[PDB]
């Protein structure tokens, strides 16, 4: 019974373990015999292996003493020159921005021969499911949020006239009856339609197109392959007739406008652009109007401590200019991503140390402590993971978020402690987000280490 | 909203035991405190017309 076939499936699982190790060793027989014979193709030195001098320096002899019944040979220690020796380290992974860490299946495609009409769930619904719109990124691992989404789950002149071929304005009669449709949708074509077999995919880009181009013709007949304007109005009645700080989390509630009922009013945080309120928000920012540099302490985005949103701040530097140097508004520098470049040194208190290559002046910005976000109780975790051997990393940005560069991070991770730093750190909110600058306390010196107080952090 | 009524006192800062404070308004230049005083408004660094809900003023 179940014995018989225990005992019929180990005696073949035995043959073919026999067979495979019968074939290894012919396969590794037969690399030995070709590397004995590379191994045969030249010889070795003689190493007469001499027993050095007898005492050629004068220093002590090495007294090997024979257990067995044979005298004690003695042989001058020739000692061996010193090497200079290097601060412990482990190694880490280099890190520039953020990077938080974890803690009828579907539609046919399109792409190739095989398509067919999809209509259950509109058609796009691969390219939905997945977004993160606030850096426009395809499942981003900045923000992992919830993602409610899984699974992969307009006034326009008439066409007028037959715009190249054939146009559904310039059938008789076919603009009353699409009035009419779109009418009850809140001489009419009484000519025969005609027949032409349509694709699945055709079908499909069609019905996308038309849910956001509606009534017009040439575009979508363009866009399309073929897709004969009279055709495609043929099929549009044809289907007719068929059927403290926290981070900006975006608020998107229709109930209500944002008083008393939004995330940001309870988070007590501006509305910024990524947020699906009213444009007329009573939580939204104001942009600066600032002549340049952004740096008096008046400054609304200085008195709240925050960025300059590009979208809102114009004229005050945030927005013109992307891809050049510095913008003249200084409170755009980390979100920009310029920092000053840090080196790596054995620190003269102790360990490693950054040196700073040029002088930093006063609340002038030197780098970003990026990292890995964790969650408190995984930034408990990796504290005691990286304690257990004296050195940790972890550093405060949020309420309930925190900056970890130990097994991921940047040059400004090694910063030395002293009871008079040369630099202090302030958190700024940067397009939604929340990031840690660093900033010179005094005007630096050229090539000093970076001293930075640890009672600000939550260990010190 | 009242007028801001200048108050004169070097040395002081004016936090909680000022007139101004206790008014909700800011330290005007005919006020006598510190020039780094708590309540003082920041003059507003417009680049023209201040008529937009973004100048503080
Ligand atoms: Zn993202
Ligand atoms: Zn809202
Ligand atoms: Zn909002
Ligand atoms: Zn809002
Ligand atoms: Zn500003
Ligand atoms: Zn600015
Ligand atoms: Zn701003
Ligand atoms: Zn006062
Ligand atoms: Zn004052
Ligand atoms: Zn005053
Ligand atoms: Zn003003
Ligand atoms: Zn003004
Ligand atoms: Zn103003």
Request: with cysteine; proline share 5%; net charge positive.
């Amino acid at each position: 019974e179940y014995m018989r076939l225990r005992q019929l499936k180990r005696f073949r699982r035995a043959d073919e373990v026999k067979s495979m190790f019968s074939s290894n060793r012919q396969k590794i027989l037969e690399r030995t015999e070709i590397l004995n014979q590379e191994w045969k193709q030249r010889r070795i030195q003689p190493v007469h292996i001499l027993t050095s001098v007898s005492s050629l320096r004068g220093t002590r002899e090495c007294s090997v003493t024979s257990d067995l019944d044979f005298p004690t040979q003695v042989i001058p220690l020739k000692t061996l020159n010193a090497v200079a020796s290097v601060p412990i380290m482990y190694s880490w992974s280099p890190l520039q921005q953020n990077f938080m860490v974890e803690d009828p299946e579907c539609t046919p495609n399109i792409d190739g021969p095989n398509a067919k009409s999809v209509q259950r769930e509109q058609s796009l619904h691969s390219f939905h499911t997945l977004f993160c719109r606030r850096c426009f990124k395809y499942d981003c691992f900045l923000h992992r949020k919830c993602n409610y989404s899984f699974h992969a789950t307009t006034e326009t002149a008439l066409d007028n006239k037959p715009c190249g071929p054939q146009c559904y304005q310039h059938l008789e009669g076919a603009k009353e009856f699409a009035a009419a449709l779109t009418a009850e949708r809140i001489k009419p074509n009484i000519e025969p339609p005609e027949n032409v077999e349509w694709s699945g995919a055709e079908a499909s880009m069609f019905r996308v197109l038309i849910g956001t181009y509606y009534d017009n013709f040439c575009a979508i007949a363009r866009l399309i392959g073929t897709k004969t304007c009279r055709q495609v109005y043929e099929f549009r009645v044809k289907e007719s007739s068929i059927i403290h700080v926290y981070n900006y989390q975006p608020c998107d509630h229709p109930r209500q406008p944002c008083d008393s009922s939004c995330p940001c009013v309870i988070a007590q945080n501006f509305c910024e652009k990524f947020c699906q309120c009213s444009s007329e928000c009573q939580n939204r920012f104001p942009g600066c109007r600032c002549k340049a540099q952004c740096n008096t302490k008046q400054c609304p985005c200085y008195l709240a401590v925050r960025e300059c949103d590009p979208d809102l701040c114009l004229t005050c530097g945030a927005a013109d200019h992307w891809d050049s140097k510095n913008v003249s508004c200084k409170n755009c520098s980390i979100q920009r991503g310029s920092k000053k470049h840090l080196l790596l040194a054995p620190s003269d208190v102790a360990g490693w140390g950054i040196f700073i290559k040029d002088p930093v002046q006063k609340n002038e910005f030197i780098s970003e402590y990026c990292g890995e976000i964790i969650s408190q109780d995984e930034a408990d975790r990796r504290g005691k993971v990286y304690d257990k051997y004296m050195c940790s990393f972890l550093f405060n940005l949020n309420n309930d978020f925190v900056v970890d560069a130990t097994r991921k991070g940047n040059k400004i991770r090694f910063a030395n402690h002293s009871v008079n730093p040369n630099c202090y750190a302030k958190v700024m909110m940067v397009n939604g987000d929340h990031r840690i600058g660093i900033f010179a306390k005094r005007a630096i010196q050229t090539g000093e280490e970076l001293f930075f107080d640890y009672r600000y952090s939550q260990a010190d």
